[PDB]
């Protein structure tokens, strides 16, 4: 969301996000089905499936997103560029 005022930027981003929703397949509603290795532009993300009780041992931003998705146990290492949008 972009705006001169910070409040307008918050509103625009919040209201637009709900119109661009993904559905994430969770294994047993707590983790990912398999280990995912991916490079988006120059950012590398390596995620590992973990057992229950492992917790979220990943980048603080990924922790925030995982709580919104509903993933409880996962490990992830971010390499390359640490751009938040990437």
């Amino acid at each position: 969301g972009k705006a001169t005022d910070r409040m307008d930027a918050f509103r625009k981003a919040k209201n637009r996000a709900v119109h661009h929703l993904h559905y994430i397949e969770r294994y047993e509603d707590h983790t990912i089905f398999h280990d995912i290795s991916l490079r988006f532009k120059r950012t590398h993300i390596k995620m590992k499936k973990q057992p229950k009780g492992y917790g979220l041992r990943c980048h603080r931003a990924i922790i925030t997103i995982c709580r919104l998705i509903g993933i409880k146990d996962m490990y992830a290492k971010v390499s390359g560029s640490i751009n938040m949008l990437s």
Binding site: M7, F10, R11, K14
Partner: peptide, 14 residues
């Protein structure tokens, strides 16, 4: 949760 100050009744109110 940080509450974004919400908009009032549309001022323009055509």
């Amino acid at each position: 949760a940080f509450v974004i100050p919400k908009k009032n009744v549309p001022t323009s109110k055509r």
